[PDB]
Amino acid sequence: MAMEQMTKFLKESTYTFTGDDVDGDTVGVIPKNMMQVNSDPKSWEQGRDILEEARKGIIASNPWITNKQLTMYSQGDS
Amino acid sequence: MAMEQMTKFLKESTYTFTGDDVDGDTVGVIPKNMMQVNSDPKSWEQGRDILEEARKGIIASNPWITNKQLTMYSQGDS
Amino acid sequence: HKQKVTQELPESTSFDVKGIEQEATAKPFAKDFWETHGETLDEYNSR
């Protein structure tokens, strides 16, 4: 039961990011709590779009990277 | 013999709780000693009902949980 | 002769430094959605 319960908790509260072809199609994991833009938690969805427009926006400005591919990480409040 | 004897001791004196679909159909284990409501030990049965009415009663009031599912635990006298 | 020892005592002080208090444990995202949209997360994705 512990596995299913921690899995459900992470599934309801987190969100994996993904980009172009990357082995395992996962680039970072941020909680759906640190991505809101309003007081209601559904607003996380809106806060998601900006990031997918920001990450791409960085790739379109910093192409010299190893792959045209960044990472993602949320420590504390950032 | 040690295995059969500790198994018999735990079987006569404890009681597993269970709820809705949970992997392994076991949510906590409380001794049949900490659930009495009278001085005679059979009364544990009565003290069981309240808990099964309390746990559900909590689920019917706190539905936002990961699963509609709590745990159970008896440390000391509680 | 005057006693060259006064009842006046030495004084030490506590290292009392106050920084910035922490925010309380913000509600879980499941309960957040609950008391804001009246229905749990499972009942919102079934639509």
Curated annotation (Swiss-Prot), chains A, B:
Q: Which cysteines are joined by disulfide bonds?
A: none
Q: Which residues form a coiled coil?
A: none
Localization of this protein: Virion; Host periplasm
**Superkingdom to which the source organism belongs:** Viruses
Q: Which residues form the signal peptide?
A: none
Described by its record, this protein's role is as follows:
Component of the cylindrical core that assembles on the inner surface of the capsid during capsid formation and plays a role in viral DNA ejection into the host cell. The inner core is composed of stacked rings of gp14, gp15 and gp16 proteins. Following binding to the host cell surface, the internal core is disassembled and gp15 is ejected along with gp14 and gp16 into the infected cell. Gp15 probably remains associated with gp16.
Q: What family does the database annotate? A: Belongs to the T7virus internal virion protein gp15 family.
Q: How does it assemble?
A: Homooctamer. Interacts with gp16; after ejection the gp15-gp16 complex composed of a gp15 octamer and a gp16 tetramer probably binds both the viral DNA and the host inner membrane. Interacts with gp14.
Q: What is this protein called?
A: Internal virion protein gp15
To which species is this protein native?
Escherichia phage T7
* Species lineage: Viruses, Duplodnaviria, Heunggongvirae, Uroviricota, Caudoviricetes
Covered residues, full protein = 592 to 669 of 747
Swiss-Prot record, chain C:
Disulfide pattern: none
Q: Where in the cell is it found?
A: Virion; Host cell inner membrane
Q: Which residues form a coiled coil?
A: none
Q: What function does this protein fulfil?
A: Component of the cylindrical core that assembles on the inner surface of the capsid during capsid formation and plays a role in viral DNA ejection into the host cell. The inner core is composed of stacked rings of gp14, gp15 and gp16 proteins. Following binding to the host cell surface, the internal core is diassembled and gp16 is ejected along with gp14 and gp15 into the infected cell. Gp16 probably inserts in the host inner membrane and remains associated with gp15.
What protein family is recorded? Belongs to the transglycosylase Slt family.
What is the annotated quaternary arrangement, including any partners?
Homotetramer. Interacts with gp15; after ejection the gp15-gp16 complex composed of a gp15 octamer and a gp16 tetramer probably binds both the viral DNA and the host inner membrane.
The record's comment about this protein's domains reads:
The N-terminus contains the transglycosylase activity (Potential). The C-terminus is essential for the viral DNA translocation into the host cytoplasm.
Name of the molecule in the record = Peptidoglycan transglycosylase gp16
What is the organism field in this record?
Escherichia phage T7 (Bacteriophage T7)
Ranked from the top, the taxonomy reads: Viruses, Duplodnaviria, Heunggongvirae, Uroviricota, Caudoviricetes
